Design an enzyme around this catalytic site. Structure first.
Site, PDB file in Angstrom:
ATOM      1  N   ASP A 143      12.901  57.036  -2.892  1.00  0.00           N
ATOM      2  CA  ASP A 143      13.241  55.358  -3.191  1.00  0.00           C
ATOM      3  C   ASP A 143      13.647  55.256  -4.875  1.00  0.00           C
ATOM      4  O   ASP A 143      12.346  55.169  -5.731  1.00  0.00           O
ATOM      5  CB  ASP A 143      12.263  54.047  -2.928  1.00  0.00           C
ATOM      6  CG  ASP A 143      12.578  52.737  -2.359  1.00  0.00           C
ATOM      7  OD1 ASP A 143      14.068  52.661  -1.729  1.00  0.00           O
ATOM      8  OD2 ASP A 143      13.065  52.299  -3.574  1.00  0.00           O
ATOM      9  N   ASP A 173      25.427  52.591   0.732  1.00  0.00           N
ATOM     10  CA  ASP A 173      24.750  52.897   1.429  1.00  0.00           C
ATOM     11  C   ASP A 173      23.599  51.793   1.336  1.00  0.00           C
ATOM     12  O   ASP A 173      23.084  52.420   0.544  1.00  0.00           O
ATOM     13  CB  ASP A 173      24.764  54.660   1.410  1.00  0.00           C
ATOM     14  CG  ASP A 173      24.001  55.145   2.769  1.00  0.00           C
ATOM     15  OD1 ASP A 173      23.868  55.321   3.780  1.00  0.00           O
ATOM     16  OD2 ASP A 173      22.786  55.589   1.982  1.00  0.00           O
ATOM     17  N   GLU A 205      26.955  48.264   2.927  1.00  0.00           N
ATOM     18  CA  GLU A 205      26.285  48.638   4.561  1.00  0.00           C
ATOM     19  C   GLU A 205      24.767  47.719   4.869  1.00  0.00           C
ATOM     20  O   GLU A 205      23.994  48.366   4.207  1.00  0.00           O
ATOM     21  CB  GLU A 205      26.057  50.764   4.572  1.00  0.00           C
ATOM     22  CG  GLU A 205      25.204  50.187   6.095  1.00  0.00           C
ATOM     23  CD  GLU A 205      24.126  51.902   5.913  1.00  0.00           C
ATOM     24  OE1 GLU A 205      23.743  51.719   5.353  1.00  0.00           O
ATOM     25  OE2 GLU A 205      24.084  52.509   7.002  1.00  0.00           O
TER      26      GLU A 205
HETATM   27 CA   LIG Z   1      14.758  50.277  -1.898  1.00  0.00          CA
END
Ligand SMILES: [Ca+2]
Ligand SMILES: [Ca+2]
Ligand SMILES: [Ca+2]
EC number: 3.2.1.1
Length: 422
Positions: A143, A173, A205
């Site tokens: 992440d 995304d 999204e």
């Molecule tokens: Ca995140």
């Protein structure tokens, strides 16, 4: 007109060259823009095998340099954009900026050199927890530390770089996983900042759920009406197009900030095979419904050639090749064209004859779209604001009449009809 006001063709897995070569057909099909798959450098797992089943590798970034074995080089990407501009079609890039690949070893030093660049890869545990959803790892994919302004400029540099190459917009995304400015003590200025570019259209999204925060996202980008996708699909399964189910977008966000679809590459390609069952006729009917609508932006999904009816990957083609010809199907195009010429006009949904298997959308007094999910021919007879005359179905064979404000004619089984003055 504008990307927002038109329809987008999702050239899922089409290579830049493939896209460049179909630009004229793309345009003649009625799409205002096309959406590419991720264009950045990714982990080309399984030795780069091009089998459709490997489509997921395009979602594991290793570097934010443009180009990968699946779609081509940055040079080819620019050529593709250029080719599209010659016919006035816009290009939207699928941007995967929330995370990178889960394979730490595969990640380029280019990003590793950025100190404190990631939140780590501790997989989310509670999908109802906004903090966990946005601060931890999705499936193990490292992440990005989006709060870090250094990663911000790095990612934004990539976006601007694509804009320069000809990209006209973005599709973010997993947008739902990047925190918003008002997410309390873990929020950031990531979205206000990276959405601040010359991009004409950008949407994220946002798979709807208790922690999606749709409306909040709607302030910086358009959002995906994933729930509405379920309604449409469900209506198609039961062959029940009751306007009592498919006229509500199932979102707090209004249509003008909505990106709709019958299905998504995810509902089709994942092992769940959630929408894979549908057929081409299901798609035509589904498209006739969502693309006849106003305000919202439809996203047509180009399935792998031969795929469908439960079958995700038939093996006819591979990553890079063009999808099925459905994208330029007479019925689909007719609706695309309808959508474009009807921009601005309001809509009036209804079920002719009280038959829930017949869908009818009336855009102002300029056009009418009909969808018959039923397996038996039907004789329509209903109110319309279309001037009197003899209209031929642009979606296929047949004709319709309007006598003293009444639309009459026959709508064949499992068929679509598009009517309006030349
Ligand atoms: Ca995140
Ligand atoms: Ca362009
Ligand atoms: Ca199957």
């Amino acid at each position: 007109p504008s990307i927002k006001s038109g329809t987008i063709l999702h050239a899922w897995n089409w290579s830049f060259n493939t896209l460049k070569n179909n630009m004229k057909d793309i345009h003649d099909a009625g799409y205002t823009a096309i959406q590419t798959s991720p264009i950045n450098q990714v982990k080309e797992g399984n030795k780069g095998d091009k089998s459709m089943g490997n489509w997921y590798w395009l979602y594991q970034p290793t570097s934010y340099q443009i180009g990968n074995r699946y779609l081509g080089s940055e040079e080819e990407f620019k050529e593709m954009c250029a080719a599209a501009e010659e016919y006035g079609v816009k290009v939207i890039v699928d941007a995967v900026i929330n995370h990178t690949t889960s394979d730490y070893a595969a990640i380029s030093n280019e990003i590793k050199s950025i100190s404190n660049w990631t939140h780590g890869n501790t997989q989310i545990k509670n999908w109802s927890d906004r903090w966990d959803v946005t601060q931890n790892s999705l499936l193990g994919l490292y992440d990005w530390n989006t709060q870090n302004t250094q990663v911000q400029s790095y990612l934004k540099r990539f976006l601007e770089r694509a804009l320069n190459d000809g990209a006209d917009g973005f599709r973010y995304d997993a947008a739902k996983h990047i925190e918003l400015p008002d997410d309390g003590n873990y929020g950031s200025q990531f979205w206000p900042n990276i959405t601040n570019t010359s991009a004409e259209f950008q949407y994220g999204e946002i798979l709807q759920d208790s922690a999606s925060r749709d409306a909040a996202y709607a302030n910086y980008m358009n959002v995906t009406a994933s729930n509405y996708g379920h309604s449409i699909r469900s209506a198609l399964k039961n062959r029940n197009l009751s306007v009592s189910n498919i006229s509500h977008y199932a979102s707090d966000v209004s249509a003008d900030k909505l990106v709709t679809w019958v299905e998504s590459h995810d509902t089709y390609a994942n092992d769940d095979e959630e929408s894979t069952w549908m057929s081409d006729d299901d798609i035509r009917l589904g498209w006739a419904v969502i693309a006849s609508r106003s305000g919202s932006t439809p996203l047509f999904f180009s399935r792998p050639d031969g795929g469908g009816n439960g079958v995700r990957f038939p093996g006819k083609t591979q990553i890079g090749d063009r999808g099925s010809a459905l994208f330029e199907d007479q019925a689909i195009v007719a609706v695309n064209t309808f959508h474009n010429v009807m921009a601005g006009q309001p809509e009036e949904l209804s079920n002719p004859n009280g038959n829930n298997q017949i869908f009818m959308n009336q855009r102002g007094s300029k056009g009418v779209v009909l969808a018959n999910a039923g397996s038996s021919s039907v004789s329509i007879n209903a109110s319309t604001k279309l001037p009197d005359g003899s209209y031929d179905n642009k979606a296929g064979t047949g004709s319709f009449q309007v006598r003293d404000g009444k639309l009459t004619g026959t709508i064949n089984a499992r068929s679509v009809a598009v009517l309006y003055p030349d």
